Paper text:
TMEM120A, also named as TACAN, is a novel membrane protein highly conserved in vertebrates and was recently proposed to be a mechanosensitive channel involved in sensing mechanical pain. Here we present the single-particle cryogenic electron microscopy (cryo-EM) structure of human TMEM120A, which forms a tightly packed dimer with extensive interactions mediated by the N-terminal coiled coil domain (CCD), the C-terminal transmembrane domain (TMD), and the re-entrant loop between the two domains. The TMD of each TMEM120A subunit contains six transmembrane helices (TMs) and has no clear structural feature of a channel protein. Intriguingly, some structural features of TMEM120A resemble those of elongase for very long-chain fatty acids (ELOVL) despite the low sequence homology between them, pointing to the possibility that TMEM120A may function as an enzyme for fatty acid metabolism, rather than a mechanosensitive channel.
Human TMEM120A was expressed in HEK293F cells using the BacMam system, solubilized in lauryl maltose neopentyl glycol (LMNG) detergent, and finally purified in digitonin detergent as a homo-dimer ('Materials and methods'). The single-particle cryo-EM structure of TMEM120A dimer was determined to the resolution of 3.2 Å. The EM density map is of high quality, allowing for accurate model building for the major part of the protein containing residues 8–69, 80–255, and 261–335 for each subunit. Dimerization starts at CCD where the exceptionally long (~60 residues) CC1 helix forms an anti-parallel coiled coil with CC1 from the neighboring subunit. The re-entrant loop of each subunit is tightly wedged between the two TMDs of the dimer at the internal leaflet of the membrane. It mediates another set of extensive dimerization interactions through predominantly Van der Waals contacts with the re-entrant loop from the neighboring subunit as well as the internal halves of TMDs from both subunits. This insertion of the re-entrant loops between the two subunits splits apart the two TMDs at the internal leaflet of the membrane and consequently the two TMDs make direct contact only at the external leaflet of the membrane through some hydrophobic residues at the external parts of TM2, TM3, and TM6, rendering the TMEM120A dimer with an arrowhead-shaped transmembrane region. The transmembrane α-helical barrel enclosed a deep pocket only open to the inside but completely sealed off from the outside. Thus, no discernible ion conduction pathway is present in the TMD of TMEM120A. In TMEM120A structure, we also observed a piece of well-resolved electron density in the pocket of the 6-TM barrel that fits well with a CoA molecule. Despite the low sequence homology, the 6-TM barrel structure of ELOVL7 is strikingly similar to that of TMEM120A (TMs 1–6) with a main-chain RMSD of about 2.5 Å between their barrel-forming 6-TM helices.
Author numbering:
A (entry chain B), B (entry chain A): 8 to 69, 80 to 255, 261 to 335
């Protein structure tokens, strides 16, 4: 009754005094860690600045041991700065604002990467079903617009997640983010395409390409998740045992990627041919052929570059 | 030369030993603060759970002093939990992922709110210029699609920023985020609208409404930034001196908002009337009239609710 409520409230008040002391100490160590953290970041930035000044002096001065020690120094400074907050890029400051997406611990980085891979897998599952209903079951304009809008949203959120990953350590190559922007522009151009003969002569091929891109993204998720888990296992306790599986997966994955690149080039050439028809009143065909060509060129060059990098090392 | 480089490298190595010790201590206090922070969050959650259990017991038990102390307790617990990380919502976990957007210090919250207001102001400036070129200068379909796409992007990023603000303390009412989703859906529906007589009979009115909404957003930014700066000044050292200006700004701002609500209702009624024409082959008019009606209803009810709340207190 009232006595039980009063006794429970007294116990809650004693626990409240304890938790208020705990929170005051928490705020104290939070301010102390913020001050020390800003000091550490400023000192690493000035250390890197003076090291780069010495580097540009020594580059025009000419020994090799100094170069090796400086390269090791720069690599470990990159790791240390990745452990610290790295502020935000241009796109992250534009969209997300002046907020810190840090994920300071390495386990947090792994969890974010795994959740990003699973997010890509689930949106791949959803996109392949919607592309299947658009290409085969239903020939409507409402569902194609819905598919293109979900493609735009998926690529924009993937750009946001990849910028977050870049902000903390991850070596996402700069082409893939621009790939996401160009694919967003492509789906936006396809959204504004009015219904007609030119749209119907390309819609089935575009939806089949989207279906194949999602199917390739399935295997990409499998390879990337396996590689991430193998790096996590090999990192702590559990080199040659990982590379073999990594190269087997890369060799199994490369022909599908190259067929996707050639399909992108084929879509670009098909849109370029369709833009020359007498029954071509839409500017969307010519302004949509260019993103497929750009995607083919950039993706093919980047894939060949990373394959050459993997073979070299 | 080589001797100068060696001496500079030795000095950099001594500073490196210092900064490596500093970083090791930083990692130590980071792990300690993370452990204490998780302990504090768990203890606040269990304290709030037991307090709510006692609250639901005492509500059906019936004293008033207990209710007043419990209300003060819940308010200060909300402030304490807002100082701590509050995880992520459904939308933030969907888009941003499992990353912490915290802004732990109150100054960080103020800086993020001010940057959000300035972002809204700059996008308002850009949107009013593009809407001016679309409504008056150029009657093209490319520029209207660009305006609608920028509207979609602006509303999506505004949804992201508002979810971030909700995640740390800010009392953004839940209607405004859904306002942003419904406006995104409206602009997406307008994107898929094919060119025709029905589109041309509504395009000028919609662009004029967008121009007026941006003009109202200018005054909204002015009022919100002034209110935020007045709360910041009055909060530290520098009640009646703020309320008077706040109510003057609210009284100057309310007729513009109500005219915007009536314009939203007028656009809904105009689209409902246009959907009944014999020359109406587009479903976009009927599926676009509904978001204007929903926006009018929700925005008008929410504005009247917050005005009644401000007048009551
Ligand atoms: C080689 C490839 C298959 C992956 O190999 P890889 O192990 O990731 O090698 P990388 O050098 O690129 O790895 C660097 C980082 O970039 C990331 N990354 C690689 N490819 C990426 C992509 N397409 N998107 C986002 N991130 C990517 C990796 O996860 C990796 O993460 P990390 O920081 O922990 O190291 C890569 O080229 C790829 O993913 N290509 C996809 C191209 C494509 O899909 N084209 C369309 C076909 S229709
Ligand atoms: C009354 C009004 C004008 C602002 O008054 P207010 O001082 O912000 O009062 P609130 O109760 O809403 O403030 C609570 C919080 O919500 C925020 N907020 C208020 N209106 C908001 C909005 N439209 N969008 C995002 N956030 C908003 C405030 O910044 C405030 O921040 P806080 O956490 O620091 O306290 C508000 O109703 C409003 O902004 N309406 C806009 C409606 C509109 O634009 N319709 C379209 C016209 S065409």
């Amino acid at each position: 009754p009232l006595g039980d409520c009063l006794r429970d409230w007294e116990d809650l008040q004693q626990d409240f005094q304890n938790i208020q002391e705990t929170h005051r100490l928490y705020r104290l160590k939070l301010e102390e860690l913020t001050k020390l953290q800003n000091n550490c970041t400023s000192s690493i930035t000035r250390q890197k600045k003076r090291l780069q000044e010495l580097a540009l002096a020594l580059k025009k001065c000419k020994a090799q041991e100094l170069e090796n020690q400086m390269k090791e120094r720069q690599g470990l400074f990159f790791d240390m700065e990745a452990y610290l907050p790295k502020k935000n890029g241009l796109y992250l400051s534009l969209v997300l604002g002046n907020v810190n997406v840090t994920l300071l611990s390495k386990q947090a980085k792994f969890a974010y990467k795994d959740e990003y891979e699973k997010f890509k897998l689930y949106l791949t599952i959803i996109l392949i079903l919607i592309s299947f209903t658009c290409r085969f079951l239903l020939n409507s304009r409402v569902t194609d617009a819905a598919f293109n809008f979900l493609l735009v949203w998926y690529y924009c959120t993937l750009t946001i997640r990849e910028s977050i990953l870049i902000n903390n350590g991850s070596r996402i190559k700069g082409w893939w983010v621009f790939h996401h922007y160009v694919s967003t522009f492509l789906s936006g151009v396809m959204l504004t395409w009015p219904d007609g003969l030119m749209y119907q002569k390309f819609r089935n091929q575009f939806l089949s390409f989207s279906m194949y891109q999602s199917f390739v993204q399935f295997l990409q998720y499998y390879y990337q998740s396996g590689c991430l888990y193998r790096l996590r296992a090999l990192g702590e306790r559990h080199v040659e045992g990982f590379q073999s599986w990594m190269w087997r997966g890369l060799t199994f994955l490369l022909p599908f990627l190259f067929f996707g690149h050639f399909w992108q080039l084929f879509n670009a050439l098909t849109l370029f041919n369709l833009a020359q028809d007498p029954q071509c009143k839409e500017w969307q065909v010519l302004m949509c052929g260019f993103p497929f060509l750009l995607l083919f060129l950039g993706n093919f060059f980047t894939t060949l570059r990373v394959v050459h990098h993997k073979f070299h090392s």
